[PDB]
Amino acid sequence: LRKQRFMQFSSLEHEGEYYMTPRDFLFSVMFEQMEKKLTKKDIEDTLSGIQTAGCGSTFFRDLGDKGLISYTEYLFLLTILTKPHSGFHVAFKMLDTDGNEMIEKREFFKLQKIISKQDDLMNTTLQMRFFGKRGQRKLHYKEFRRFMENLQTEIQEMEFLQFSKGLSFMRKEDFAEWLLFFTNTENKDIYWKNVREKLSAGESISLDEFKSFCHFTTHLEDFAIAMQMFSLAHRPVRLAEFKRAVKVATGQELSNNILDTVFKIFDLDGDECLSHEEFLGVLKNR
Amino acid sequence: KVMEYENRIRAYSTPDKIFRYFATLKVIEVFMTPEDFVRSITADEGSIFYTLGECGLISFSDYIFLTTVLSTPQRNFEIAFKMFDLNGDGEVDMEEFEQVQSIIRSCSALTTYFFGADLKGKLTIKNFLEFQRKLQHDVLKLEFERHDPVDGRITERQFGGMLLAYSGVQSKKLTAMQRQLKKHFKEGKGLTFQEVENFFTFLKNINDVDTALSFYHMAGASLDKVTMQQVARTVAKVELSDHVCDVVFALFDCDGNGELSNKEFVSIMKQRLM
Ligand SMILES: [Ca+2]
Ligand SMILES: [Ca+2]
Ligand SMILES: [Ca+2]
Ligand SMILES: [Ca+2]
């Protein structure tokens, strides 16, 4: 039913096809539920807007409202939003079928669109960026990887800034709220009790720490298959064990502030050392 | 009835009961001769269980280690080896292994095979991966030759039997289609060992195949033979023959639409990995 979300948020109209402006894609990924016309001037707008916005991590924010996002670009971005980095490469290989280390326009454009159409019946910005103004250039691995990482970093920045009330630093209370919303387990008042009684009015959480925790959250299955050793032996996990475990199983090095906060929040037994039931049996949602 | 009993305790009972059920020799603690290990799941030179058939026998730490070596993919086994390495030098010693063995329990065979006779050796990543590879290969070879092959080829009914036995789900519809696998191939060109081993190698990497197949999952599309072969060759580095995917599509395609959906094939073989 992704087509329903898309046709709901989409804004521009051309012969029964509904295109999104980028500021609609940002809303679609940020806001869960919230609250037309297209003309050739809008077409020229989207044709021109690609040059104004840089290819950095702030691509979509600088674009603004001058853009076009087809349905397949929307589904592809959704796919590439939750890619564990180990998968990056393989995704490229699934588009590059001839194996020339490059994605031709007809290599993917025909492919994703054609499987869309086939499951149905039975010049947009991202394309203008991946294949130049005339739709003839080629894509390589380094630009694809930089774009994936920039998109993920941009969504992470927007999450952090939405939850920190526009300020440069979250407070540990606000990150606790973010974590509780994320594990969709705010119902249990025990976590609110813990954050009220142990997380004082103190240290903040900068941008990089939140970004590191996010990158850890996407690699959660590797972490589960790393800790299955302790799980099959029914062993609680101290702080140093957990820090080295994330550092090894996901490559990301978690700060001591974020781990202190998590240990303070999810400590039901009050032992200063987490266990499988209290952390992974809960984050199975993610 | 007692065979069904031991099958079910193999299915869900604890390995504490299973090892203590199939072990035969006790010490001071109980030990199992490697033959009990080939029995717990189901040797001339070159076989694995002869190089491990030398003294002594298999402890409970060695049993659990073998079962978690068989049931783990490759790129997770690399992270497991990195976990073993406490000091972070890049080469695992006997001490870290002894620590995690103690954690497991809460011997000669395994530790003298790995770290040498005097245990003074140090492991690396290549020997670990090669050990896992040889284990899985020579488990599969016995599983295969167990079916009474002829000219080194098994018929497709028995290959379907292998597939559904591995899948861990048995339903009357699926068993009926397994029986129909004989009707579908009236002549039959057999299944060699290479194709079977290749397909099971594909099945071991299924949790990554699923990640590479995310656009098809979200778009709602299904899996035909060509895309299955492409994702196999790209993710698992296997060359799925036309006949193995032929039999898989003849078996797991309940609705006969000609193509497998996510819930038909990938979900089953992924949750089997648990
Ligand atoms: Ca190409
Ligand atoms: Ca605890
Ligand atoms: Ca070491
Ligand atoms: Ca089907």
Residue numbers in the entry:
A (entry chain J): 85 to 119, 125 to 211, 231 to 394
B (entry chain I): 110 to 137, 144 to 157, 189 to 252, 275 to 442
The authors write:
The mitochondrial calcium uniporter is a highly selective multi-subunit Ca2+ channel of the inner mitochondrial membrane that serves as the major conduit for uptake of Ca2+ by mitochondria and controls ATP production in response to cytosolic Ca2+ signals. The protein MCU constitutes the pore of the uniporter through which Ca2+ ions flow and EMRE, a small transmembrane protein that associates with MCU, is necessary for Ca2+ uptake in metazoan organisms. Ca2+-dependent control is conferred by proteins that are unique to the uniporter − heterodimers of MICU1-MICU2 in most cells and of MICU1-MICU3 in neurons. At the ~100 nM resting level of [Ca2+]cytosol, MICU1-MICU2 and MICU1-MICU3 heterodimers prevent ion conduction through the channel, and they permit it when Ca2+ levels rise.
From biochemical analysis of the purified protein, and in acoord with a previous report that MICU1-MICU2 has an affinity for cardiolipin, we found that the heterodimer associates with lipid membranes and lipid nanodiscs that contain cardiolipin. This association is independent of Ca2+ - both Ca2+-free and Ca2+-bound heterodimers bind to liposomes. To investigate the conformational change in MICU1-MICU2 upon Ca2+ binding, we determined a cryo-EM structure of Ca2+-bound MICU1-MICU2 in complex with a lipid nanodisc containing cardiolipin at 3.1 Å resolution. The side of the heterodimer that associates with the nanodisc is the same as the one that faces the channel. The structure reveals a substantial conformational change upon Ca2+ binding that makes the heterodimer more compact and markedly more bent between MICU1 and MICU2. Ca2+ dependent rearrangements of the EF-hand motifs that involve their helix turn helix elements produce this bend. Ca2+ binding also induces a rotation of the UID relative to MICU1. Superimposing the Ca2+-bound MICU1-MICU2 structure on the UID in the resting holocomplex reveals that the Ca2+-induced conformational changes in the heterodimer would place hydrophilic regions of MICU2 within the membrane, which would be highly unfavorable thermodynamically (middle). Rather than inserting into the membrane, we hypothesize that the bending motion of MICU1-MICU2 acts like a lever against the membrane to pry MICU1 from the mouth of the pore when [Ca2+]IMS is elevated. The conformational changes would dislodge the UID from the blocking conformation, which would allow Ca2+ ions to permeate though the channel while [Ca2+]IMS remains elevated.
